[PDB]
Design a protein around this ligand. Structure first.
Ligand SMILES: NC(=O)c1ccc[n+]([C@@H]2O[C@H](COP(=O)([O-])OP(=O)(O)OC[C@H]3O[C@@H](n4cnc5c(N)ncnc54)[C@H](OP(=O)(O)O)[C@@H]3O)[C@@H](O)[C@H]2O)c1
Ligand SMILES: NC(=O)c1ccc[n+]([C@@H]2O[C@H](COP(=O)([O-])OP(=O)(O)OC[C@H]3O[C@@H](n4cnc5c(N)ncnc54)[C@H](OP(=O)(O)O)[C@@H]3O)[C@@H](O)[C@H]2O)c1
Lengths: 284, 283
C-alpha cells in the first residue's frame, strides 16, 4: 500500500483533529502517512508522532503533503514555503488574508504541479446539507444570516470577513455569486459587530452579520424569505459528523485526480470570489 | 412541507428505517413517518401506529412507501404502491427477475414517481476505499468471497440475488461484466455458489457466496493489477449510517436534484446486475 507522507504544521484545535483523523482507520487515511508535525513550540511527541523542524520538513523527500493548520496570519507564509519545497498543500480557511496572495499561490501550485486546497468543513455540516436541499426549488425575496461568537484576535485570525468566510461561503454556495452594496463595522475595546449588505445576481438583498464579544455563546441565526414562503430556523437536523475527515477525503480525491477540470475550476473561482468579497468588505 | 412515509415490513431493515426517520437528520426533515404496515399485529413501535395495507394505499396523506419486507414479496408491494400513486424505496434486491424490474421501472416512469433500489453496500467505508484504490489501475485477475449463515431461499431468493450487493461492488469497480460459468453445491444445511465473470477488457473475476451453519458473516477479497496486488482491505474503520445515507439519495431524487444522465446510468447498472443474477441462476 503506497501512502503519501504528511506533516501537520501548527498543533492547535484544527491540528489536533487532523492528527487524530490521520491516526485513526478511515478510507482517506489509508492513503496517507503521518510522518510528523511542526510547531513553533517544543512539544516532543503527541501520540507517538514525533515533532520535526520546518527545516527538515521542507527538506524531506519522505514528506509530500503539508497540512497547514496555524493561525490565519501565517498561512500565506507557510503555503508558499511548502509549495516551493515541492509539497502538496491543504490549508484551513482562510487560505490567505488577501486576494492577490491567493492568486499568486494558486498560480505557484499550478506551475509546480501540486494540489493546493482550502478546507471548507462548513459545506459538510448537517445544517448545510439541509439548506442545500431546502433552497433547491426556490426564488429568494430577502434573507439574513447572523453569527455570534467570543472575541477573536484580529492580529492572528484576521479581519472578521476573513475569519468568518465560512458564513459567506454558505451564502455564496446557496445563492450564487454576490456583490457588495454596503458594509459597516463597530469596534469597542472587548466587543465588535460587522454588518454587511450583499445582493445576488437577480438583485435580491442578503444581510450578513458577525458579532464577537465576551459572554456570547457561539451561535448561528438564519432567516430566508422566498416567493413561496419563508424559513425562520434550521430545524434540529442532528449533530455534525467528521466534518474534517470528510474534507480530508476530498483532498485525497484531488491527490488521486478523481475530480474534473470543470469541477476544480468552479471551486477555484468560488474561493477567489469569496476572498475578494472579504477584501472588498474590509476596504468599505 | 414533508412527504408522508410508511414503512412496510418491520424487520431488521424496517427498524433501521423507522429509527432514522424518527431521529433528526437532514434527510428526515423532508419526510414524515405516518405509520407502518406489518403482516403481524404489533400495535405501535415508538409512538408510531400500525396501519393497514388497505388504508395505506388509500391515504392521500401517504406519498412514499419504504418496502422493507423479505425479497420474495418486494415485487408484489412495489406494484401495488406504484399503482396507488406512491413513490417507492425498496431494499435490494428490488425483484427476483429482470422482467419484473423492467415492468416496475416502466410503471414508475408512466405514473411519474420515483422507484429506488437501496444499495447501502456502495456507502460502506470498505467500498469508499476500494473506489479510490482501483482508480488508477488495470486488473489482471480478481476474486471476492462472501460467507454467512444459512438463508431461506423461499423468502430471500437465490444467492446471486440475495448477494447482489457483492455483484454490485464488482460491477461498480470494474464496469459491466459477462458470465463465463457458474456452479452451485447444496447439502441440506450447507451451500456454495461459484461464479466466473469477465470484464469488457476480458479479465477474469471470481465471485463466491458460501452460506452454512457456524459460518461468521465475512468478506474476503483479492485483486491483481499490472502494477501490483491487494490481498486485504485494511482496517478502514466502521460503517456509519449507511441506511441514512441511502435515504438521503432517495430524498435527492424526490427533489429532482439528480440529472437524467445520472438517473439513467443507475437504472442501467441496476438492471445489468439483476440480469446477471438471472443468467447465473439459469446456468
Ligand atoms: N479548529 C476549527 O474548528 C477551525 C475550523 C475552521 C477553520 N479553522 C482555521 O484553522 C486555523 C487554526 O484554527 P484553530 O482553531 O486550530 O487555531 P488555534 O487553536 O487557536 O491554534 C492556532 C495555533 O496556535 C499555536 N498555539 C500557540 N499556543 C497554543 C496553545 N496553547 N495551544 C494550541 N495551539 C497553540 C499553534 O501553532 P504552533 O503549534 O506552531 O505553536 C496553532 O497552530 C485558522 O486559520 C482557522 O481559521 C479552524
Ligand atoms: N438486514 C440488512 O442489513 C439489509 C441490508 C440490505 C438489504 N436488506 C433487505 O431487507 C429486506 C428484509 O431484510 P431483513 O434483513 O430486514 O429481513 P428480516 O429482518 O428477516 O425481516 C423481513 C420481514 O420478516 C417479518 N417478520 C416476521 N416475524 C418477525 C419477527 N419476529 N421479527 C422481525 N420481523 C419479522 C417482518 O414482516 P412483518 O412486520 O410484516 O411481520 C419483516 O418485514 C430484504 O430484501 C433484504 O434483502 C437487508
Amino acid at each position: 500500500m503506497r501512502k503519501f507522507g504528511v506533516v501537520v504544521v501548527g498543533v492547535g484545535r484544527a491540528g489536533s483533529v487532523r492528527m487524530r483523523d490521520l491516526r485513526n482507520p478511515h478510507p482517506s487515511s489509508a492513503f496517507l502517512n503521518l510522518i510528523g508535525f511542526v510547531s513553533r513550540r517544543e512539544l516532543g511527541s503527541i501520540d507517538g508522532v514525533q515533532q520535526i523542524s520546518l527545516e527538515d520538513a521542507l527538506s524531506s523527500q519522505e514528506v509530500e503533503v503539508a497540512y497547514i493548520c496555524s493561525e490565519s496570519s501565517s498561512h500565506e507564509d507557510y503555503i508558499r514555503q511548502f509549495l516551493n519545497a515541492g509539497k502538496h498543500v491543504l490549508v484551513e480557511y482562510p487560505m490567505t488574508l488577501s486576494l492577490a496572495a491567493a492568486q499568486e499561490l494558486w498560480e505557484l501550485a499550478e506551475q509546480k504541479g501540486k494540489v493546493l486546497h482550502e478546507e471548507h468543513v462548513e459545506l459538510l455540516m448537517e445544517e448545510f446539507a439541509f439548506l442545500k436541499k431546502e433552497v433547491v426549488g426556490k426564488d429568494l425575496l430577502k434573507g439574513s444570516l447572523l453569527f455570534t461568537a467570543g472575541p477573536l484576535e484580529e492580529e492572528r485570525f484576521g479581519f472578521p470577513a476573513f475569519s468568518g468566510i465560512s458564513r459567506l461561503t454558505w451564502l455564496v454556495s446557496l445563492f450564487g455569486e454576490l456583490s457588495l452594496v454596503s458594509a459597516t463595522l463597530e469596534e469597542r475595546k472587548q466587543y465588535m459587530k460587522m454588518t454587511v449588505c450583499l445582493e445576488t445576481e437577480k438583485k435580491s438583498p442578503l444581510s450578513w452579520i458577525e458579532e464577537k464579544g465576551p459572554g456570547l455563546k457561539r451561535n448561528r441565526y438564519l432567516s430566508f424569505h422566498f416567493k413561496s414562503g419563508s424559513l425562520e430556523n434550521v430545524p434540529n437536523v442532528g449533530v455534525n459528523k467528521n466534518i474534517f475527515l470528510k474534507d480530508q477525503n476530498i483532498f485525497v480525491q484531488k491527490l488521486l485526480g478523481q475530480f474534473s477540470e470543470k469541477e476544480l475550476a468552479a471551486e477555484k473561482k468560488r474561493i477567489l470570489h469569496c476572498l475578494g468579497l472579504a477584501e472588498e468588505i474590509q476596504k468599505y
